Amino acid sequence: LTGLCDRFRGFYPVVIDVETAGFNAKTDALLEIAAITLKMDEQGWLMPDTTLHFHVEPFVGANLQPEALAFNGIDPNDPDRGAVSEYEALHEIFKVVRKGIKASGCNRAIMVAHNANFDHSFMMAAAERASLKRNPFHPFATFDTAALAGLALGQTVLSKACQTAGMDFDSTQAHSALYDTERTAVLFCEIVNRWKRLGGWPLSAAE
DNA sequence: GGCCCTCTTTAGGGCCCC
Ligand SMILES: [Mg+2]
Ligand SMILES: [Mg+2]
């Protein structure tokens, strides 16, 4: 291929997972976020690059759903969380992403996530509140690993997709931002690498 | 949390992005 900028029409894939206090991106709090950039080796194989992870303070006036907190087991009132503002978390992620875009020769970043619209809507909403400028992510395009796993593995559930792909998946570590992002990143890389392995990529190898 | 299905309506379990 072999360069990352040539693989997805100049899009720089960044794996994202968020933990929230509900399903409403407009009103519910962002509590946690992890980001994993990708890279290709000289042979053209995809693999994780830089990993970021932040605990996030609920923005002022945010709604908190008890059922959501019960699911992710996150206590926003814990002073020992080490949480930062949405601004600080996303500002650092954007900085690393813009740096990755520049070095790779890509044009823009695209979010890779499982059921990606969820994570995308929450990140865009948080960027709006924090008044962040020059959002390096595509405003509506995403790489949904649920759809990709549907094609590649015939499974749409993250746990099952990883297992089907022959990956390790610990249910005791599941539903945590860093672990979910890492497993999603490996899943996405495996799907992409498998397609190359089967001769589906490059298009000349599609033959 | 709330919609969906059915071995349903005097119910609960699946869903599986929180
Ligand atoms: Mg998730
Ligand atoms: Mg998660």
Ligand 2 centroid to Cα of residue A181, in Å, is 7
Which residues, 6 or more positions from A34, have their beta carbon under 8 angstroms from its beta carbon? A16, A17, A18, A51, A52, A53, A54, A177, A178, A180, A181, A182
Residues 148-187 of A with CB under 7 A from strand B: 156-159, 175, 180
Given the structure tokens 């298009």, which residue do they identify? A203
Q: Does A88 show up as a binding residue in the annotation?
A: no
The number of domains in chain A is 1
Whole-angstrom distance, CA of residue A137 vs CA of residue A16: 11
Q: Does A175 show up as a binding residue in the annotation?
A: yes
Say if residue A80 is exposed, middle or buried (CB neighbours under 10 Å; 0-12, 13-18, 19+): exposed
Phi, psi of A8 (to 5 degrees): -125, 60
CB A81 within 8 A of CB A147: no
Ligand 1 centroid to Cα of residue A103, in Å, is 28
What amino acid is encoded at A79 in this protein? Answer: P
Q: Does A78 show up as a binding residue in the annotation?
A: no
Phi, psi of A74 (to 5 degrees): -100, 125
Closest residue, by C-alpha, to the C1' of B17: A115
CB A207 within 8 A of CB A199: yes
How far apart, in Å, are the Cα atoms of A152 and each of A99, A168, A188? 31, 17, 10
Say if residue A48 is exposed, middle or buried (CB neighbours under 10 Å; 0-12, 13-18, 19+): middle
Domain span at residue A168 reads: 1-207
Q: Within 10 A of A101 (CB to CB), how many other CB atoms are there? A: 21
- Nucleotide with C1' nearest the A21 CA: B18
CA A185 to chain CA mean position, Å: 7
Quickly give A119 CA vs B3 C1' distance in Å. Answer: 22
Whole-angstrom distance, CA of residue A100 vs CA of residue A106: 8
Cβ of A67 < 7 Å from strand B?
Answer: yes
The domain that holds A4 is classified in CATH as 3.30.420.10
SS3 A35: strand
H or E segment to which residue A31 belongs: strand A30-40
